[PDB]
Symmetry: D2
Subunit: 360 residues, 4 copies
Amino acid sequence: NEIPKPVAPAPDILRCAYAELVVTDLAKSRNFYVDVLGLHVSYEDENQIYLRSFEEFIHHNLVLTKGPVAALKAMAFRVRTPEDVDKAEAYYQELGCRTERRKDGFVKGIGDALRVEDPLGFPYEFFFETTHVERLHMRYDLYSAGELVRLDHFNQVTPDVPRGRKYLEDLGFRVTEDIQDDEGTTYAAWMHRKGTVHDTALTGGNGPRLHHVAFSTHEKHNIIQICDKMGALRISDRIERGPGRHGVSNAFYLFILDPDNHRIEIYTQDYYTGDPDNPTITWNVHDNQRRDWWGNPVVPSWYTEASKVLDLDGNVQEIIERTDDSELEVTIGADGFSFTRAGDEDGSYHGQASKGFKLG
Amino acid sequence: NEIPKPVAPAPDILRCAYAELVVTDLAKSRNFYVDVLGLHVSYEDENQIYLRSFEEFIHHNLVLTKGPVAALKAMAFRVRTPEDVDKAEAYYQELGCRTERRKDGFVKGIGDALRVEDPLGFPYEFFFETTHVERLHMRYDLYSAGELVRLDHFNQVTPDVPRGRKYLEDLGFRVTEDIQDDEGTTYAAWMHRKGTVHDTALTGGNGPRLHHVAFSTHEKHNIIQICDKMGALRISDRIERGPGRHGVSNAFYLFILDPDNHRIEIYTQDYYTGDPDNPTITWNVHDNQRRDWWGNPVVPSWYTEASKVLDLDGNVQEIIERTDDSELEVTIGADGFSFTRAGDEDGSYHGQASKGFKLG
Amino acid sequence: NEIPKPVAPAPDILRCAYAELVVTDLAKSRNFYVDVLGLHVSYEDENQIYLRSFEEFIHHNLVLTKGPVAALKAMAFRVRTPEDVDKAEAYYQELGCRTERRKDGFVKGIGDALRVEDPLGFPYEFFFETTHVERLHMRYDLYSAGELVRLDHFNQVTPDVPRGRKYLEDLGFRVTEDIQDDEGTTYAAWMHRKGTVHDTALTGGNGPRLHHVAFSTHEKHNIIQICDKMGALRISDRIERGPGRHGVSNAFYLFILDPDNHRIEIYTQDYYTGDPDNPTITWNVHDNQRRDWWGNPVVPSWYTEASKVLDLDGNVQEIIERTDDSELEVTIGADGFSFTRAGDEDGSYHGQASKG
Amino acid sequence: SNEIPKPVAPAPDILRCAYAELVVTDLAKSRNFYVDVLGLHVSYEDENQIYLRSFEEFIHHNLVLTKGPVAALKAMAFRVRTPEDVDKAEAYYQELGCRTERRKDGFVKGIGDALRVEDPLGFPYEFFFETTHVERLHMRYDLYSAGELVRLDHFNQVTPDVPRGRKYLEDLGFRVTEDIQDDEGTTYAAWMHRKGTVHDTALTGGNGPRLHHVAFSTHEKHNIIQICDKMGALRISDRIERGPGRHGVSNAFYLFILDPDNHRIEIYTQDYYTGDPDNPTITWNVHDNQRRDWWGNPVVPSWYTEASKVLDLDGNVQEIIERTDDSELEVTIGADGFSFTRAGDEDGSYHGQASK
Ligand SMILES: O=C(O)Cc1ccc(O)c(O)c1
Ligand SMILES: [Ca+2]
Ligand SMILES: [Cl-]
Ligand SMILES: [Cl-]
Ligand SMILES: [Cl-]
Ligand SMILES: [Fe+2]
Ligand SMILES: [Fe+2]
Ligand SMILES: [Fe+2]
Ligand SMILES: [Fe+2]
């Protein structure tokens, strides 16, 4: 069931700007994002923490909101002009979606804002106006050895990737890289507005769920330092996967889990995608260098676990089951297969993960 | 069982200096060590390749010798003076070990040398004299993105770690770190002469076998580049384990396998151990940050696979079985366990490895 | 002398894309750019070498063209669509500028291209069509310890910075950072299309001349390696300035000199500027942390030396003298002044450069 | 005949440089520099002293800041291998005719039995073995700073007659690794080691005795860059004296900075292994412009002429003896000096002038 291209013009989206995450214990979450990860506090009170990255000038990149059920409450994109908020509203209304408009914003530091239940069941916000704050990009007196310098992207779990992909292309995101097989199945797609590999991405699975939010560092050693620090704090069990080099994106990466199991990616040094004919790279799902370029196995939790998302009323969205093939199953499951070198049996894996591991 | 301390004085050992490895196909080994890893050729012909690291001034750190069966032929330590080779000869004769003395060396670029079949079945060489070559430490016109700058250590698999440790202590090696359990079994020990964490190390297991030879890089990014390069060359299947941060040693590391399955470690940034009261560090075998500080699982091959070693006639030394508990079995096997925080059930793994994998 | 805003719509410029440099000895230049700096050859013949950075997919980022006088021949920007090359043509005509349009390109690997002598006397090219090549961004088998990964920007020397700034703003470039004094003089401005600090910059001085072309590395150590390699090759005399951390741009940098003295910057880790209200940063010209954040002195040659530029016929553009104050003279000349802390005499410099 | 005769008494077995005691005039300002700016770790403090250690250290401290009226080095301390080596050090310096002081309970907190001496070159050396062990912070990445100082690496002493001091240090078991000489036979500097790095101390030709600097190492080059960046952000870039750079001698990445009393601190990383007894000694020509900074960056005159006072055992300032051998400053960057990039080549050489 294809999502039609509206007649109304798409809003001009600049970039991913922030996420609002609902958390169950604010103090424990603050300890994770401020004390462990070093994000900068823009505002806080008893109910909310507003956090930003080292180079950000908008009010925040992350809002932690106390609530009963941990979930993604909104993924927010900044648009180019105030008038793009009107465009967003008309666009989503034509798509048949629920929309909510607040002239004074939903969260502090954001002005006129539109939140929508998009056609994949995701809570998207579009805004232009935001309170500028001190841009800390040269505050080396604050710089941490693991400093998170920007918000980079979101990653969304959704059951039908081509359906979502077409809708995001209409909205103006261009696909930079994807994962497919020779039987017609799409497992994942990465798409951008701002000229990095992505602003959001679709990962095939039961959804809507939020796979992760990603922040970048300047250098690879900053990511290693996050791991080293987590060991020193004796919370290495909260390192889910990595560090590694991605095939898709070519970025150095790490996946870690917050106190409510919301997944955060730390990412650095992908490439420029701003040209309109930027070459799209398609990887085969059975290529064992596609997710970790060094062939390290992808733990099953990476495929199966992700965050609930909320509707505009704050209720959890119902999960829709993926009927397409499962990336986990076709690569590391019982009938799974992966290769190091296409057409070579040597360095291939049958019914198990790479490097001597099987599904727990 | 105990190896008695000789009356004769121990030779004064400076450091690990080189290893002679037998390889089955010299051209494929050359491609690995020179083309992929960038070691520098000191001499080569149809029978052998002599290699050194970027900062070395003695003739070589690695001798690749063509032969029928891939194996360790000699692990060589440089001693402080010519007279120390005579001391080594009297010491090992008093231990009742087979010795062989050659006034003009066993390999090119080494003069007066003593090879011995040591009490643990290992072929050790001791020498002083060596041919000096151009020290390439400032040849940044040659420097690779993955440059190996020094030879750091060896690691030996032996069935009885305390027996081996005591013998190495009598030789003047001082233990820096070890791994034990609460019921008094030792699984591994690291010991040094030069003022780093180790020059050699003992891993509990069936032996004698050589676990690995280790080279250093200057920085962590150099190790990441070795991985990246192996991905580009589509030999990621030869990355056995890593990259990571060690617990023991605190060094950043990677383990890779040469064309004959000889294991090479790439290592950087351990600490100073030259003071005679340098504090020892004992880890518990079930501490999941002891080998990889980030808790990443140790691949089973790391525990079970190792190189054959040769006796002084070039025949393979018979293997003696370990009867103490297995590190693999007590940590990641069906009956094993490991913890992130001592005492804490959260972040503990029972009957499987960390991060969600079981043994393949 | 104000350059009027045309009625015709400006072209939609994506980014700086390539420079064409005339060089006098193709072999010596090849050695510098390929052997020393490790740039990748897309094409080469007896008269020209076409080079690209590690992550590029268009044909080239740099064209070295043999000729009698070393100079900038074209600074090229890619536009979003084929129809934007028409927009660029109608725009520069209305500006009264000389233009030349070639459906098959001026250099190999570029299709329909427009060249112009712009109102500041610089040879700009606008194009969409380019021959795609193998993007080498994951070819870590080729990756050098000093690897240049992207083309980042150009920097132009021009006598009147406000004049040039207004023209580039009308053209769609937004100022990210600039250097001014409290007497109303502007010494420099940086401006962007692609969302880094700049695609081009204006440096106040006698012009038109090209100050430098800049390539990125992934990390700071890659720039260090470039220096270390130049010492090993015993060509450290071709390191002009750096390495350092910029005040303006916040980027780690190095300036070196090619065999014809064309200045090349290596640059890494500036910040994101793609929001349309990106805060502009204005530095005072006397702030000694503005160019080198660590306060290292800027050598006079950096201010006085720059490359000649050619007009559309291949002749050197005549240089027009700057009449506004000189950044060299007001900071490090005999009556110069700079400070470490605004208002503090301690750590200030009178009539000389910082650090002794 | 001015020679320092080798004693018949055996030399103490010296392991490494271990700590320095620096007298500072304003303890709070000094604490801000060493703790807040540089990130050293507090091992003990009170209203008179601050005891500080690096990230990987297990002995009590690497730096003792002592409040006093006149900023000076009070002691440069080396750890010896055994308690009996302190007895050896006493017999050895007594035979040299040096003034000595033995305190069985130490001179500073966390050190036990210790000997201080006014050595033949006028420097206050300490020899101890006994020290209180503390928590080794090597894996405390929860404390690790972007600019983390991980070890104490070395001292550098200014002395007028380098061969005279060098032979005295060789007798004490220090081995020269590198030096700087000219064709006429003058020695300008020498570096010498006990522990297996390029040096534990070094001698710089000049008026002495003065302490040139104390040096700490970082893990990687980016940690040094970060010190510079932090000092820029704190607007104290005027306290960055020289660097950052690649050294010729030692091949280490380096930075020189100045504490509140103008004590010079080097930050240093990635020299090479020197533990073999026939470690090749490297001699550089004083006119080689890559010997100090490998990239050819000039050495600011203050690096050659400024250094800290040292104290005698009563706490008074040691009188200075002026160098009569040729001055490295004068022969390289002074009115009659010169330096080269490539030996014998006028291109890239500097006459009566520093580089760049
Ligand atoms: O650059 C120089 O001045 C030579 C040099 C080398 C090593 C050092 O530790 C040092 O202080 C000085
Ligand atoms: Ca198939
Ligand atoms: Cl992935
Ligand atoms: Cl290990
Ligand atoms: Cl600048
Ligand atoms: Fe991601
Ligand atoms: Fe090892
Ligand atoms: Fe620039
Ligand atoms: Fe030094």
